[PDB]
Scaffold this active site. Structure first.
Site, PDB file in Angstrom:
ATOM      1  N   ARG C   4       0.853  -1.148   0.000  1.00  0.00           N
ATOM      2  CA  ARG C   4       0.000   0.000   0.000  1.00  0.00           C
ATOM      3  C   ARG C   4       0.911   1.227   0.000  1.00  0.00           C
ATOM      4  O   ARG C   4       1.819   1.305   0.845  1.00  0.00           O
ATOM      5  CB  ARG C   4      -0.881   0.012   1.241  1.00  0.00           C
ATOM      6  CG  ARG C   4      -1.621   1.346   1.273  1.00  0.00           C
ATOM      7  CD  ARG C   4      -2.423   1.543   2.528  1.00  0.00           C
ATOM      8  NE  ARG C   4      -2.788   2.942   2.763  1.00  0.00           N
ATOM      9  CZ  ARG C   4      -3.957   3.508   2.384  1.00  0.00           C
ATOM     10  NH1 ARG C   4      -4.873   2.796   1.725  1.00  0.00           N
ATOM     11  NH2 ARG C   4      -4.310   4.744   2.769  1.00  0.00           N
ATOM     12  N   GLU C 107      -8.909  -2.534 -10.327  1.00  0.00           N
ATOM     13  CA  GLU C 107      -8.020  -2.181  -9.253  1.00  0.00           C
ATOM     14  C   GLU C 107      -7.527  -3.403  -8.486  1.00  0.00           C
ATOM     15  O   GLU C 107      -6.402  -3.346  -7.959  1.00  0.00           O
ATOM     16  CB  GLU C 107      -8.727  -1.255  -8.311  1.00  0.00           C
ATOM     17  CG  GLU C 107      -7.884  -0.056  -8.047  1.00  0.00           C
ATOM     18  CD  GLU C 107      -7.902   0.929  -9.202  1.00  0.00           C
ATOM     19  OE1 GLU C 107      -8.819   1.757  -9.223  1.00  0.00           O
ATOM     20  OE2 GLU C 107      -7.007   0.871 -10.061  1.00  0.00           O
ATOM     21  N   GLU C 109      -8.256  -4.716  -5.433  1.00  0.00           N
ATOM     22  CA  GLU C 109      -7.865  -4.313  -4.099  1.00  0.00           C
ATOM     23  C   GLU C 109      -8.172  -5.409  -3.119  1.00  0.00           C
ATOM     24  O   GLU C 109      -9.054  -6.250  -3.328  1.00  0.00           O
ATOM     25  CB  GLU C 109      -8.612  -3.106  -3.636  1.00  0.00           C
ATOM     26  CG  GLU C 109      -8.305  -1.933  -4.515  1.00  0.00           C
ATOM     27  CD  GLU C 109      -9.123  -0.681  -4.223  1.00  0.00           C
ATOM     28  OE1 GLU C 109     -10.340  -0.782  -4.026  1.00  0.00           O
ATOM     29  OE2 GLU C 109      -8.519   0.395  -4.200  1.00  0.00           O
TER      30      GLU C 109
END
Lengths: 41, 103, 185, 103, 103, 103, 103
Positions: C4, C107, C109
């Site tokens: 991250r 994405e 995630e």
């Protein structure tokens, strides 16, 4: 209704509280010091 | 010997199992004379004590009372859930005889 | 591991007990009823932050994906860090839990419920003028043995936690129907 | 037995309840001869001790003194908040008789 | 001396090595008179006890029984995997004689 | 009683305060006969010991010596910062009389 | 009065310094009669024991043997690196006389 979002926040916080206790069981146990019970009694 | 806390608790007169399945809410510890004890409470409103070593305590129990107070202090600090308690119901607060935790 | 990018420095992360969701002060802080909602988190955007609101902190599956997002959100920052995070059951794969309702599927995630504790952070890279310094600083407080086996939470445990509003079509369809909270669908 | 720290504290003469609601700021531990004690202080400026084993103590209190010094060291290190302290206020620093924490 | 738990275990009568490679599922601790013991279970269904300090124990063994109970509480709380247990198989539940943990 | 480590250090002859404000750099523990001691070092270059118990020690100091070795092992393992040390400087290495930690 | 483990180690007959510079690979603890010991191994394939308590051990050494087993358990669980070991090379496995840890 409001129950769906309260319930969601509530099942989410219980899942979080339980994972936080596993984390405290890891980091606080480094501080646990054993007692010689025969000597102190 | 017993294999579970219910089996063990059944061997004694004046005991009852409480299913707690919750962490300890408050922990109190005393070193005041004649009240060297620990008191624990739950959000249910229940209060339990580990009793002051005394006259009705055979000596093998003395090293076990000490162990139970250490187990309760670290269970409280880590927020570990207690599953069941085997308690003597002839004392106020009821007195802890055995504890189990799982997972 | 998961990655991250974030502008909060290692010392700020140690002092807070980890990578915190928006508004949450330190990790064990019970002093705020923090809203926690995966659907809401996955649709939010915060300027200068990779998604971290509605009680979750978003991470990426690779260092390159983390840097790409890092350079889209934190561009021109003289310094920011990419944290390397171990997988554990507080993490949910967003695409897997939200399915076809996943808002940014590209994405990929993986979001951590309640933030990432400091002991779950394996290390970090310093990013200078957008270029990753490839020397990983290791977090000596990382609990190696504990996190060594662990993995992300299975989607099955997050379906009940998806957070879709009560009227969303998802609660009436598979797989969420079979995991719908009281008052949803 | 008492069920709360206040009920316990009021069975003794010269005791007082302090509400702290805070974690310990500093911990001092001494093994200096005749001063084997722990002193804790709070950001409030309050200082408390676990007194040296001595004559004022019954035999049973001596293992409870050792347990209390163990509780204060792990409470300081994990930064746990203390709720209240029952202290003997006849000496300075006030001496701890009982401690409660709630979660 | 032995250099391994399977070779330490090999040297007693009525012992059995169990390869567990798992963390403890539940922990039960009793201070009830004559049942001052710890019982641990695994998800596979195995239950093991640390015996009540009985008569066949030497005093080196009294201190070692206390240590083993300390190890099992800290292992349960930190979820550390146990590799192997050496047990006395002429007891029910089987009784722990030694434990090993790896990595 | 004294209220801080500097006040307490001042009641003893042959003592001085070391402001450390740092974690322990190395920890050595010996169980070799007649030298059952702990030695700690800091980055600042100083070495300190917890003395082998003997007859410079009252029975009260013997519990306290064991407690200090317990505290120094935990502070070392956890990289906890020590604030000040009161030591007797007529020993080689200087011997620890008291320790303080500030949050 | 040694200031380091090498200094200390050189004061006894039959000792050897081992530079390990690694964390413990496995931990075994036995409560089996006559074998109340701890065995640790390293990735190096090196095995060491804390020797059984016996009549040859003076009470200072008895307390220090129990401290060393406590130190080896929490070193293994915290995955702390050991720097050197001073051992009695005259036994199998070599017996720990002292341990040092750095940083």
């Amino acid at each position: 209704g409001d129950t769906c979002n309260e319930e969601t926040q509530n099942l989410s916080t219980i899942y979080l509280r339980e994972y936080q206790s596993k984390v405290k069981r890891q980091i606080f146990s480094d501080y646990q010091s054993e007692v010689d019970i025969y000597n102190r009694i | 010997a017993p294999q579970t806390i219910t089996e063990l608790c059944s061997e004694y007169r004046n005991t009852q199992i409480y299913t707690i399945n919750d962490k300890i809410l408050s922990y109190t510890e005393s070193m005041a004379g004649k009240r060297e004890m620990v008191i624990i409470t739950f959000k249910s409103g229940e209060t339990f004590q580990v009793e002051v070593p005394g006259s009705q305590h055979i000596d093998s129990q003395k090293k076990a009372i000490e162990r139970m107070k250490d187990t309760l202090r670290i269970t409280y600090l880590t927020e570990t859930k207690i599953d069941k308690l085997c308690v003597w119901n002839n004392k106020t607060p009821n007195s802890i005889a055995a504890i189990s935790m799982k997972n | 591991r998961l990655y991250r990018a974030d502008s909060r420095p290692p010392d700020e992360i140690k002092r807070s007990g980890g990578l915190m969701p928006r508004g949450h002060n330190e990790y064990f802080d019970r002093g705020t009823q923090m809203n926690i909602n995966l659907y809401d988190h996955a649709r939010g955007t915060q300027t200068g932050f990779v998604r971290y609101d509605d009680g979750y902190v978003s991470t990426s599956l690779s260092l390159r994906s983390a840097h790409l997002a890092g350079q889209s959100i934190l561009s021109g920052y003289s310094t920011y860090y990419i944290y390397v995070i171990a997988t554990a059951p507080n993490m949910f794969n967003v695409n897997d839990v939200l399915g076809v309702y996943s808002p940014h599927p590209y994405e990929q995630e993986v979001s951590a419920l309640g933030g990432i504790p400091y002991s779950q952070i394996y290390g970090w890279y310093r990013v200078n003028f957008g270029v990753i310094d490839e020397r990983l600083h290791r977090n000596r407080e990382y609990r190696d043995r504990y996190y060594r086996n662990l993995n992300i939470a299975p989607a099955e445990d997050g379906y009940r936690l998806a957070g879709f509003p009560p009227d969303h079509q998802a609660w009436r369809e598979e797989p969420w129907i079979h995991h719908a909270p009281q008052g949803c669908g």
